[PDB]
């Protein structure tokens, strides 16, 4: 479909018969516009006290993100976890609740196209708990740019249990905005990602929010092929089979290769 799908080598798996079928992916974002003809939202929950409906995306964020998961893993079961409000901001508690819901709800993949500058013990316990449970936890690295020799990587992405996804363009080049550091795991396409928008729309968005779902989507592709495989197995598969870009501080392991990861 869109360039980022080809880039990650997704199509090669679609042809072979691997589309993410029977994989449960939670999008912990501003909701998903379930009304979108293309989007099949299987369920969800809201943790935003003022925004009761998970299936309503007042931002556009969550709908775009969900769209990306679906283009990579078209047969995957999408779950909308509303943690962010119309403004794009959310409480750490709302987020924790969203992680907890995903665990309790037997999610296979968590997508967190979100990040903050500071962490919490409650945050780390939650993410680490998702991992202990067998969930593949995906998060954007952040859009912090550089800070000399300092890690720019936001939370929950900073955490080792969480796959930290940075951004590349269609030329395999690091996006200027892309958070850097030892904590950066993988690179996925995040420059001008054309996806689903609320109210039967499509539009381009840039950021690590865009890169993350490509990995969340890639993870669902591997689980469709290897149903038996642990989160640990999925993650290793992804990280170990990458297209090596520059330095690890900037690129991590490089670009994901869904085709090589699926063996």
């Amino acid at each position: 479909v869109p360039y980022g799908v080809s880039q990650i080598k997704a199509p090669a798996l679609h042809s072979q018969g691997y589309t993410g079928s029977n994989v449960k992916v939670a999008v912990i974002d501003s909701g998903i516009d379930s009304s979108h003809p293309d989007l099949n939202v299987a369920g969800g929950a809201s943790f935003v006290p003022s925004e009761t409906n998970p299936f309503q995306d007042n931002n556009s964020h969550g709908t775009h993100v969900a769209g990306t998961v679906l283009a990579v893993a078209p047969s995957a079961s999408l779950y909308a976890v509303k943690v962010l409000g119309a403004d794009g901001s959310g409480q750490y508690s709302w987020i924790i609740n969203g992680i907890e819901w995903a665990i309790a709800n037997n999610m296979d993949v968590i997508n967190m196209s979100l990040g903050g500058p500071s962490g919490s013990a409650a945050l780390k316990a939650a993410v680490d708990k998702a991992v202990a449970s067998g969930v593949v936890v995906v998060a954007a690295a952040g859009n912090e740019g550089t800070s000399g020799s300092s890690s720019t990587v936001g939370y929950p992405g900073k955490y080792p249990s969480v796959i930290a996804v940075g951004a590349v363009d269609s030329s395999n080049q690091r996006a200027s905005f892309s958070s850097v550091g030892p904590e950066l795991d993988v690179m996925a396409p995040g420059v001008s990602i054309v996806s689903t928008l609320p109210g039967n729309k499509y539009g381009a968005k840039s950021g690590t929010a865009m890169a993350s779902p490509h990995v969340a989507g890639a993870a669902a592709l591997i689980l469709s092929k290897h149903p038996n495989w642990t989160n640990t197995q999925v993650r290793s598969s992804l990280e170990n089979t990458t297209t090596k870009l520059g330095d690890s501080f900037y690129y991590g392991k490089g670009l994901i290769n869904v085709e090589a990861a699926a063996q």
Binding site: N59, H61, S89, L114, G115, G116, N143, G207, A209
Partner: peptide, 4 residues
Amino acid sequence: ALAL
């Protein structure tokens, strides 16, 4: 936490 903010949208990425």
